[PDB]
Design a binder for this molecule. Structure first.
Ligand SMILES: NC(=[NH2+])NCCC[C@H](N)C(=O)O
Ligand SMILES: NC(=[NH2+])NCCC[C@H](N)C(=O)O
Ligand SMILES: NC(=[NH2+])NCCC[C@H](N)C(=O)O
Ligand SMILES: NC(=[NH2+])NCCC[C@H](N)C(=O)O
Lengths: 398, 395, 136, 394
């Protein structure tokens, strides 16, 4: 009835590397058939010079939050973060990201944006959201920007195993898909040691056991090595950043099916166009500690055989510019096929979602169309020309 | 950035006469009226479209949850802000360039207003109220929970000094404007529509404090005693004004109290709204109010009272605001007077000068329309061109 | 310093979710009374309140009176009752007028004071305490 | 830049005093040897012996020192005003890096940061925040009636509460964690020979602070609490008053420092008795004082690390060096006593590049009239103070 026939230059098979010339039948938000299709009632997407790949994924974004800057922005409410979230969700879609993992926000406004996408109120990718990130008092996902007279801890601050239990349950109650915790200190926070473990292992194992009990996945923020070791031992599904991972604990991550969401683009934003744009000098000195060592360890992680996914920490840099990491990923030692695989099938498995990440029969119609061949030039993912999410066309240029 | 607009003609909203001339726009303002030389920058060839000033609504609720059903019951207040982004764009594309938002929660109204003001999103220029002020159990209280919860809404105030303080709190957090409820309402649970809410003393304290900061004041009032008291307290508009009579139309005239009378929306509530979610207690109060309001709208216009275009958008779908124009002329206004009520008459009420006329120096809020609106006013329901503040939104 | 909610000597630098008001924020004559008492108790020599908005604060109007005259009179009576003097921050004219009428001992800044209310200050022995350097 | 021409400097490793000149640039000792060459300016000293800047491992700089009737309803800010005074008094006495060991409201971190930023003069402080304690303990406030239900900031009463408060102290800027492991002298209603905290609570504090790379000091007079603090794995036991042969050996094996204050008893039982110290405290001092410096002697003899810590605040700030005489009196060589206040403290504090006149180390340098190895009481009236290459006293 309301079906689409997509005529293209080819589609990428993401298991093999093969570009296959075929047409695609789209019904009920799914890829129905692949090949020659006899149809007379379906409308035709004539898109003859575009190569097709499955919809790209990001394992580490922050879509909701205030991106307003300067003196006017200071007493802005939390709802300004939600207004921006709407804008940023649309911007992530138009760059060909169709399922993303939103990995920390406040007040369950992440679940709101998600749900309003699900209900077709606003255009955006399918978000899997964390809720409030769980942290220790004065940790990286605590907020340390206020005098002690305020005694302000942020929403997800927990300091015992049963407190951490209770916050996982609370997040789930208010609709979260996964749990993020901070396992070390961080770049962007005030007064956090990048090299120090935050949480006891007991607290880490309590977060994980509860999250898995309800079939939720756990991401862990960890730059420093002791906190990477402890996250893996606790049984997390992904280590975010993973900056000072060594040979022995890469082997740990391989052994326990632990994914490494390694944001290797973003260090060029912070030191480059971010020192000008209001990032504090305490953060920049921590960034100098992290950035080059992460990329060296990213290369060593891939070669030793660890699963790496495509996370960007978008929100730091502009939403929409996520696919700039693709260049950085062939630079630091993946083949271009492995780079897209990291943003499709490897992310899909981390996300725990079946029937996305492939142009295959029965799979969801999350389809991105592109000018040049991405196995020859990966940098055309930075300027996509066609976006289809769940059967609906959102971007078409010609 | 400069624009020359090639019109079929502009409505002069003061005289009535449509005038065939061109308009030059530089930096969000109308520069020139007449035939203009053309050296630098770009031309908008329009030519089938007669030009009117950007329209105004003086009673909207752009922010709020418009998701419905079983899925939406535990939705956070942030869903109402998502919908706020949506409804603002929808209100702008309907040719409404400056509106008066009249109740929201959590200062999400100022969040949506400021984002428009910063060019983060698209929408009209919102004048926002913050939380509306009510008595315990009043119309702008939320009477939907058991006594065990003891829930009161944000603007609940119950003494003159409490009310003083909430005006201040709303000013502190961004409000342009104070709205309060002076009678019971239609859309609320457990309120009598003919009962005065707030003492005179409470009412006067709200007004005095808001005027002290140069804030205008709107009072929700259906019942007569409430309307009288609100006028007597010195408000800048009575909203709804449903049971206004001969004596207090006259009270409103001598005081420059605007009447903001929403004469469309009863037909939505008693028609399409009955299955759309609206409670039976609310439908019973709409039967009391609906017919008699436009009867009294006709009377107030006859006796010479200032009436502005307020719709209560948010009950009906945002975008469909313009449907009231036909109702306005059906119940006694000339087509000119109905457009005057959403341009020059709202602009005075809003307190903003340099909008709502196609005059040199005024802001470039301009909407292009298909027919002659002094002949057929229902053209405003189908607009083809939206300029707000120089930038082009619809073509 | 005593102020209204959102006044010059409130702290309008935080999101509404924090609901922060500074130490001396008062919004009724009897609250204002009590704060004068609280300041005396913990050892204050004089009372300062804010009568208009000001330069250094976020979201205040310099020409807008803050406080009713009723609140202002309460602050002044209570402070004079304990033999405290009263200073009143007031840039805009309507505030200056109102402070003097309440019976303040000094008006701070006094930036928009007209002929008639210069004379009001003369007649009442009200002092003008005027910071004419700091603008530079 | 600076060139210091001197009678000589103490080499604190060897003990032999060396006649040389010192070149100071960018707040460090650049060169040791004979120079008077190029850049900026000489410091004409001649007659002073140079030693590394002195350290105190147990002070209380911030706190109200006003007494009597006026001070009764004083806010916590008076203690901060006094901290500014007491920092200068400590620095001018030749003490260049100190361990502040329990203040309230994070006023210690304020006073520290003010010194760091160059707002005020004082020594480099390592600060504890509030000291952690049980309900009713030594570092609880035991002075108000039941109806107030008052407990001070660092009152914790479970392992996870204790964890959280370590984290809170870190959050607001603390360098280390003090906790109380027995009762005290200067408190109401505490038994000096009774342990406070379970071992499990103590281990929770130690494990959490060490995780953030924070040192842990444990207040302990009584023996059973000293034992339990060492087994918890603290970096120092303060006072250490009733330590025996067997658990001195525990402290050697686990490298637990003993920060023993052996001067202050004589202040308390003498001038302090009429200064407004309660009779309950004076009685508890008579239990502790004599036996402490006895057990000092036994601890030093057996091979335990002892640092210079004084409990200044009880006595007047700047009188800290009076302890030096007491430490030689009770078994140390004068070298060992300065070693206790320099290189022994620098290791305890966890700070590299201080405590020595060596090349590359920080320019914390104190000038003294007589030979300190002759009479140590020269340190009670120092003539020249340099901290980080700035000269504060002449
Ligand atoms: N080199 C990087 N990965 N930089 C980004 C780090 C972002 C992370 N939220 C942190 O502050 O730790
Ligand atoms: N006849 C009307 N204007 N009906 C609509 C009334 C809407 C108003 N907000 C109320 O509930 O009272
Ligand atoms: N022209 C001046 N005196 N300016 C300084 C005013 C200072 C005062 N505290 C205020 O913010 O209002
Ligand atoms: N002999 C001594 N060290 N006496 C001083 C002990 C002082 C310590 N602050 C306490 O109250 O316990």
């Amino acid at each position: 009835s309301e079906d689409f026939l997509i005529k293209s230059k080819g589609y990428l098979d993401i298991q093999t590397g093969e570009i296959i010339k075929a047409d695609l039948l789209i019904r009920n938000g799914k890829i129905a058939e692949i090949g020659k299709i006899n149809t007379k009632d379906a409308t035709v997407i004539s898109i003859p010079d575009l190569i097709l790949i499955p919809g790209l994924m990001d394992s580490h974004v922050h879509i909701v939050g205030n991106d307003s800057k300067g003196e006017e922005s200071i007493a802005d409410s939390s709802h300004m973060g939600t207004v921006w979230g709407v804008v940023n969700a649309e911007k992530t879609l138009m760059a060909g990201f169709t399922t993303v993992r939103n990995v920390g926000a406040a007040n369950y406004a992440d679940v709101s944006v998600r749900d309003a996408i699900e209900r077709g109120v606003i255009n955006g990718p399918t978000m899997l959201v964390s809720g409030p990130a769980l942290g220790i008092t004065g940790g990286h996902c605590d907020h340390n920007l206020l005098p002690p007279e305020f005694n302000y801890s942020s929403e997800g601050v927990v300091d015992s195993p049963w407190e951490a239990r209770k916050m996982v349950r609370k997040n789930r109650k208010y609709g979260a898909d996964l749990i993020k915790f901070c396992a070390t200190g961080g770049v962007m926070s005030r007064n956090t040691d990048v090299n120090a473990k935050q949480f006891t292992l007991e607290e880490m194992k309590a977060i994980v056991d509860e999250a898995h009990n309800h079939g939720m996945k756990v991401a862990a923020h960890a730059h420093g090595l002791i906190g990477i070791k402890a996250a893996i031992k606790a049984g997390v599904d992904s280590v975010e950043h993973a900056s000072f991972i060594d040979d022995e604990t890469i082997d740990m991550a391989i052994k326990n099916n632990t994914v490494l969401s390694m944001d290797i683009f973003v260090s060029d934003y912070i030191l480059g166009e971010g020192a000008k744009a209001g990032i504090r000098e305490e953060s920049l000195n921590k960034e100098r500690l992290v950035g080059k060592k992460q990329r060296e360890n990213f290369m060593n992680a891939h070669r030793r055989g660890a699963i790496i996914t495509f996370g960007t920490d978008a929100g730091i840099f502009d939403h929409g510019d996520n696919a700039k990491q693709f260049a950085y990923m062939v630079e630091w030692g993946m083949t271009p096929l492995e780079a897209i695989q990291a943003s499709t099938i490897k992310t899909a498995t981390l996300f725990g979602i079946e029937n996305i990440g492939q142009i295959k029969e029965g799979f969801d119609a999350d389809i991105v169309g592109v000018i040049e061949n991405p196995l020859a030039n990966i940098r055309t993912l930075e300027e996509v020309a066609f976006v289809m999410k769940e059967g609906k066309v959102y971007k078409r240029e010609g």
